RNA sequence: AGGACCGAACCGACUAAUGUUGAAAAAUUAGCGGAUGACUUGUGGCUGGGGGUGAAAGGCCAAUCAAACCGGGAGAUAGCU
RNA sequence: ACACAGGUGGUCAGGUAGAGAAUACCAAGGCGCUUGAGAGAACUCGGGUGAAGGAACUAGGCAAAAUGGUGCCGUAACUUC
RNA sequence: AAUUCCUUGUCGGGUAAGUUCCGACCUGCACGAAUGGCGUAAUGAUGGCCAGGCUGUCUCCACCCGAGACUCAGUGAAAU
RNA sequence: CGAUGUCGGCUCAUCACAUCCUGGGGCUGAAGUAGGUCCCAAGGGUAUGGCUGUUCGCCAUUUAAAGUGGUACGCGAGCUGGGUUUAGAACGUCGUGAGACAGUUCGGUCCCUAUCUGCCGUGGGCGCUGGAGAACUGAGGGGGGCUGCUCCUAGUACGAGAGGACCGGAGUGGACGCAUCACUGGUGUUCGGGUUGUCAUGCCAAUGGCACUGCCCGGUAGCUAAAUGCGGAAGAGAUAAGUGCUGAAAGCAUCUAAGCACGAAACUUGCCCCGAGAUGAGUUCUCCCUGACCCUUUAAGGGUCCUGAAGGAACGUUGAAGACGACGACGUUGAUAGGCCGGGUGUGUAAGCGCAGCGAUGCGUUGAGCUAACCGGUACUAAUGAACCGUGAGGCUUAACCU
């Protein structure tokens, strides 16, 4: 059973949930606040959170990283540049999880994820 | 597998009682922006704790 | 860790080379039997003109197991094969008068002195 | 009587003969007494004790009322021993943890891990059917609960799938390997049941 | 947690060297026949090396009279007495358990310089 | 060369599991047999009910066959329910 | 009977390994199977691994596990050659 | 013996143990010569048995991944 | 017969005593050991395989023993379906023939979403006469009970010998059960590494996708068993069969009619667990509410204004608690979760550069890099100031203290 383990399955097989994993973390990067449901979000936190941790010491080695965590050199060079810096001064803790109601065709329990420096 | 009588209304009644829902027992309303909203969501408008963070 | 219809081999020069065992003794649903314990064995190849035949029925201590046993501090002494040191029937003596391989001292008792005099090492 | 220890975690203890023991380190601090019952007060001879220490806005005014005129400082619970004649406790003691300075084995009665919705097989150790050999939707099902109409009705305790677990049990006579009357800690041998910060009751032993 | 870290710091040993997985070791240990503690020379390639703290082991496998003889010491425990390296191996591996399906001359390993 | 060999198309249907008020009034999955022949298949034709056709099981003849289906004799008859 | 994991004949047949129209990844192209969100109990289905033993299971090695390829060495009883 | 009741006939091999298997004995209830007799290399999604390899088939189950089951929201049957 | 599915195996069992072991005895054609037979006793225990469809059996080998029966020859809305008892086929025999054979081989669909009772768990309601939070006592129920071997007593008693005790004491095992992860290990599709094919990141380099996790190799936490802790008792009561002491009806005798003592794994207890819905609703401790009127049918009555306590509930962060409820921790006066820092463990020398070789690759940086669930810390985010249910001294009759 379920005795001291970490991690939601979301109804997802695991290369499934990895790969939706780092395809929701691009979005957030990108889009600077997303909307998802609840455990989803509550799930990327310890994943978006990561990548600004180990973007906030900027090498070659620690950008092949997270050019291998997120796959993508959109995020990869926005993250080294604007979100290395911005979190410079911030012992963890990046993002802000704000619940805002419910999904209208499947109550979903919806929730807002930004980033802390996001205005 | 299958039901040997009919049952009554009585019996149906009693089942489902506890079937029925309770209600949200009391909306907060925000201080600064005056409007209802459940307890730890955010408004309509945006609102949530006084300040507006979104769009 | 050896149950019926196991496939132990010989560790002395009595004579068998492959025997199986049938029935280990000591209780009732007896399941395993360690090293030091006394089982039951049939012997299904002889060297050719050797003390045991082909087709009998005789007991046998086990000496070596796969499975190790464990010491009163945990270190467990694994091997690579399960073994066996032939016995007789009625007297339960060692038939055989030299033991090959190494030896255990879990069997260390009043009862396998002979034994664990003539194996090579102790281990 | 007894101590209220808190069960820290499980190690070795080895001794100079080489032997490696397994070791349970039963954290105790001073049990606080809170309340001493006899018969013409209240019914049988028994002590009440406490152990830790809760915050002050989550106990409550009951509670706090109740160690406040008790005369001890706010603790964590509640525990009551029976008192064996010979025993005069005060209402301001603090039961050390030197009580067992002297005994060699300890009975520990602690909740055990809940492990959920078990099964027979993992509850009750039943068996299975087999896993070929035609089986159809019975690899590990209980299989027949009674018999043809004389009885008609499951007798009752029979052996089914429910809760395993999350219940008071209680090991008998593990034995007190050492006190540590500086760390407080109560170094038994064993298993004693419940998982890491599970409240275990440690009395000297019966049989 | 700290208290268990102290009741194990508190007997745990002092004079580990340094052993990796594949130099081969010889470990003197206390074996008592009769009422006489003396020592036992077991020498073999280490396979298995596991760290807890006091529950440390290491995993000795020899040839001994042809039927191999693994024997996992508990590092931390006064049965061993003296751990000492032979000669320094090297595998790119971390638990040897690839040498137990070869025998002889295909179970040798490259010398650390 | 072959009613040869191993093997995909294609024809099947030997074993197991899943379904069986299912996804399906016989199927899916994993294995399996033949796979240049007594093979298989498209399109059109032919044989009609005591009749057809049958490498033969009383099989198949429109999800029905120890004698189809539709109408008629017909409100057969029923010492039976 | 259904917006049904079933059935249906011809034509066109790219890349990389491959003997191959198998197989794995792909291009052009087309789609994500018309209910979703959780939680990670029993139990069931499809699966993966396993100490030590290896048919002791059982009606029965049923099922699974293994063996698998290309070149070379080699090959018995029997035999209708 | 796909024919054999008594019958698990008797003897031998195989196994520690073999109502099945294989080889003989003939006492064939009730085989038998084109409704064929007896042989037989090849062939068999065929029948019976043994052995090597292999393994959760098992001693004894343990964990893990997914689809259901369970909870919320929508639509919503059935045999009885 | 408008149907109750019929042998055997698996899985669960439960009861009886006409007992197979273990417990207690009486007799013995009982020296001891091993026994024979009879009486009390059902608390536990009661085998693995070969062949057959088997129950049964025979056999091999253990065991303390491998109980005899019921329970629809227990159990197919739980499971094979080998046999029996469908449709194919054949052999012997019968019948001229269609066919038949408790004769024989070969092959042959075992459906169901649980309404009610029952049972295993777990909750909501209200009650318990003011309310709330805690601990309890225990009426009553359940669990558990098995035993081998070795040694001491002591080769003593006994016996001519061989052999070999009773009673008691100690240890070490089997089977069963509870607990746990510290050890040995398994798993560990969320960690690390190798590697095949191919596609993509413009390309080399480095990585990612996909092929059961692509195939392997290790493995953290957790769960686990083969792993390691513990248990069964001791003792007390009343006893059964049996043994008695004293003792008369019956001057003797007599275990019994008066009286008393001994006596078993059986029953009540002792050990563990549930347990005041135990409506017979118990006990003790703590905390909180000390305001107004208005009315008629005056009542343990209704309505209004102010009040809203103790606490609970809701919400949120969640848990070694969990199907959902429930139980536990925490809500800024804060470590609950995530993050972050340090560590530990795991894997096993990352990338980039430089050197060496023609080149694959090696060497130096390098025990480096990466490190899930673990450990100790840090408010960086998220756990909102509230609002909500709950009230405002708690009836009558008697009795005891008070004045
Ligand atoms: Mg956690
Ligand atoms: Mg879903
Ligand atoms: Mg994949
Ligand atoms: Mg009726
Ligand atoms: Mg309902
Ligand atoms: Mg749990
Ligand atoms: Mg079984
Ligand atoms: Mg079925
Ligand atoms: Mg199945
Ligand atoms: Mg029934
Ligand atoms: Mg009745
Ligand atoms: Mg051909
Ligand atoms: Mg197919
Ligand atoms: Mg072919
Ligand atoms: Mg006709
Ligand atoms: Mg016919
Ligand atoms: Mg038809
Ligand atoms: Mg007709
Ligand atoms: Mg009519
Ligand atoms: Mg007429
Ligand atoms: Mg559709
Ligand atoms: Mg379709
Ligand atoms: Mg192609
Ligand atoms: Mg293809
Ligand atoms: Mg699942
Ligand atoms: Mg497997
Ligand atoms: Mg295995
Ligand atoms: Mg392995
Ligand atoms: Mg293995
Ligand atoms: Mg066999
Ligand atoms: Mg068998
Ligand atoms: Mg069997
Ligand atoms: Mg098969
Ligand atoms: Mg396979
Ligand atoms: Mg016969
Ligand atoms: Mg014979
Ligand atoms: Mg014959
Ligand atoms: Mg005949
Ligand atoms: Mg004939
Ligand atoms: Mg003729
Ligand atoms: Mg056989
Ligand atoms: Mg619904
Ligand atoms: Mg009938
Ligand atoms: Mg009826
Ligand atoms: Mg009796
Ligand atoms: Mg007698
Ligand atoms: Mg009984
Ligand atoms: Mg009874
Ligand atoms: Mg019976
Ligand atoms: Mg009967
Ligand atoms: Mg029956
Ligand atoms: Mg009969
Ligand atoms: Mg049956
Ligand atoms: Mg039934
Ligand atoms: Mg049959
Ligand atoms: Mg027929
Ligand atoms: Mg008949
Ligand atoms: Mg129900
Ligand atoms: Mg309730
Ligand atoms: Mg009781
Ligand atoms: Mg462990
Ligand atoms: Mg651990
Ligand atoms: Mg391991
Ligand atoms: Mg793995
Ligand atoms: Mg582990
Ligand atoms: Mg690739
Ligand atoms: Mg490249
Ligand atoms: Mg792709
Ligand atoms: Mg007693
Ligand atoms: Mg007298
Ligand atoms: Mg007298
Ligand atoms: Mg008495
Ligand atoms: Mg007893
Ligand atoms: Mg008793
Ligand atoms: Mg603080
Ligand atoms: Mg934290
Ligand atoms: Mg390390
Ligand atoms: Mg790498
Ligand atoms: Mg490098
Ligand atoms: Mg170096
Ligand atoms: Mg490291
Ligand atoms: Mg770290
Ligand atoms: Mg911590």
Redesign the pocket.
């Given at each position: 059973?379920?005795?001291?383990?970490?991690?939601?399955?979301?109804?997802?097989?695991?290369?499934?949930?990895?790969?939706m994993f780092r395809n929701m973390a691009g979005s957030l990067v990108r889009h600077e606040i997303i909307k998802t449901?609840?455990?989803?979000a509550?799930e990327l936190?310890?994943v978006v959170?990561?990548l600004i941790?180990?973007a906030?010491t900027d090498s070659?080695?620690?950008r092949?990283?997270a050019?291998?965590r997120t796959?993508d050199?959109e995020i990869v060079a926005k993250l080294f540049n604007e979100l290395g810096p911005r979190f410079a001064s911030?012992?963890?803790?990046?993002?802000?999880?704000?619940?805002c109601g419910f999904?209208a065709?499947?109550?979903?329990?919806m929730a807002y994820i930004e980033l802390?420096d996001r205005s | 597998?299958?039901?040997?009588?009919?049952?009554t209304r009585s019996?149906r009644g009693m089942?489902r009682s506890?079937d029925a829902?309770?209600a949200?027992?009391?909306l907060?309303?925000?201080?600064t922006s005056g409007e209802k909203?459940?307890?730890?969501?955010i408004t309509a408008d945006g609102y949530?704790?006084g300040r507006k963070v979104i769009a | 860790?050896?149950?019926?219809?196991?496939?132990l081999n010989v560790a002395d020069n009595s004579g068998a080379r492959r025997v199986?065992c049938?029935?280990?003794?000591?209780?009732?649903?007896?399941?395993?039997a360690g090293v030091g314990d006394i089982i039951?064995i049939?012997?299904?190849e002889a060297i050719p003109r050797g003390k045991v035949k082909?087709?009998?029925?005789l007991?046998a201590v086990v000496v070596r197991?796969?499975?190790?046993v464990?010491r009163p501090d945990?270190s467990?002494i694994?091997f690579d094969?399960?073994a066996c040191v032939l016995l007789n029937?009625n007297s339960e003596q060692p038939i055989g008068t030299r033991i090959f391989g190494p030896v255990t001292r879990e069997l260390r008792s009043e009862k396998f002195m002979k034994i664990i005099s003539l194996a090579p090492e102790v281990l | 009587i007894g101590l209220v220890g808190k069960k820290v975690?499980?190690?070795?203890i080895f001794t100079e003969d080489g032997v490696?023991?397994?070791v349970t380190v039963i954290e105790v601090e001073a049990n606080r007494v809170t309340?001493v019952?006899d018969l013409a007060?209240?019914?049988?001879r028994?002590i009440?004790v406490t152990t830790g220490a809760?915050?002050?806005?989550?106990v409550?005014?009951?509670?706090?009322?109740?160690f406040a005129?008790?005369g001890v400082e706010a603790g964590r619970?509640?525990?009551?021993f029976?008192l064996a004649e010979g025993e005069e406790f005060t209402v301001g003691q603090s039961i050390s943890v030197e009580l067992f300075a002297d005994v060699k084995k300890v009975?520990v009665?602690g909740?055990?891990?809940?492990?959920?919705?078990?099964?027979?097989?993992?509850?009750?150790?039943?068996?299975?059917?087999?896993?070929?050999?035609?089986?159809?939707?019975?690899?590990?099902?209980?299989?027949?609960?009674?018999?043809?109409?004389?009885?008609?009705?499951?007798?009752?305790?029979?052996?089914?799938?429910?809760?395993?677990?999350?219940?008071?049990?209680?090991?008998?006579?593990?034995?007190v390997v050492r006190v540590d009357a500086e760390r407080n800690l109560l170094l038994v041998?064993?298993?004693?049941?419940?998982?890491?910060?599970?409240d275990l009751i440690v009395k000297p032993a019966?049989? | 947690?700290?208290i268990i870290?102290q009741l194990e710091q508190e007997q745990m040993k002092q004079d580990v060297p340094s052993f990796?997985?594949g130099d081969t070791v010889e470990v003197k240990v206390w074996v008592v026949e009769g009422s006489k503690k003396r020592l036992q020379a077991f020498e073999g390639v280490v396979i298995?090396?596991?760290?807890?703290?006091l529950?440390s082991?290491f995993?000795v496998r020899k040839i001994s009279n042809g039927e191999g003889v693994?024997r996992?010491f508990?590092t931390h425990s006064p049965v061993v007495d003296s751990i000492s390296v032979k000669r320094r191996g090297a595998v790119?591996?971390?638990?040897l358990?690839?040498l137990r399906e070869r025998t002889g001359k295909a179970a040798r390993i490259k010398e650390r310089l």
């Open positions: 059973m379920r005795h001291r383990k970490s991690g939601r399955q979301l109804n997802r097989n695991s290369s499934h949930r990895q790969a449901t609840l455990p989803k509550k936190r310890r959170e990561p941790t180990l906030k070659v080695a620690n092949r990283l050019f291998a796959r050199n911030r012992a963890g803790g990046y993002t802000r999880i704000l619940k999904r065709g499947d109550n979903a329990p802390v | 597998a299958v039901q040997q009588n009919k049952p019996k089942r506890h829902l309770t949200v027992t009391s907060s309303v925000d201080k909203h459940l307890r730890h969501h949530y704790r | 860790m050896i149950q019926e219809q196991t496939m199986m049938i029935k280990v003794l000591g209780g009732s649903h007896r399941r395993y039951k049939t012997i299904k082909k087709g009998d029925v007991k197991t796969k499975k190790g464990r945990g467990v694994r094969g399960n029937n | 975690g499980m190690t070795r490696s023991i397994p309340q019952k007060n209240d019914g049988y028994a009440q809760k915050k002050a806005n989550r409550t005014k009951p509670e706090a009322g109740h005129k008790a619970g509640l525990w009551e029976r009975d009665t909740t055990s891990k809940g492990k959920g919705f078990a099964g027979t097989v993992k509850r009750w150790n039943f068996r299975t059917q087999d896993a070929t050999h035609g089986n159809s939707l019975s690899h590990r099902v209980p299989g027949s609960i009674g018999q043809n109409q004389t009885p008609g009705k499951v007798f009752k305790g029979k052996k089914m799938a429910g809760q395993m677990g999350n219940e008071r049990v209680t090991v008998q006579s593990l034995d041998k064993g298993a004693v049941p419940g998982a890491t910060g599970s019966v049989k | 947690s700290n870290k990796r997985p298995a090396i596991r760290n807890r703290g529950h082991a995993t693994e996992v508990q790119r591996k971390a638990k358990y690839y």
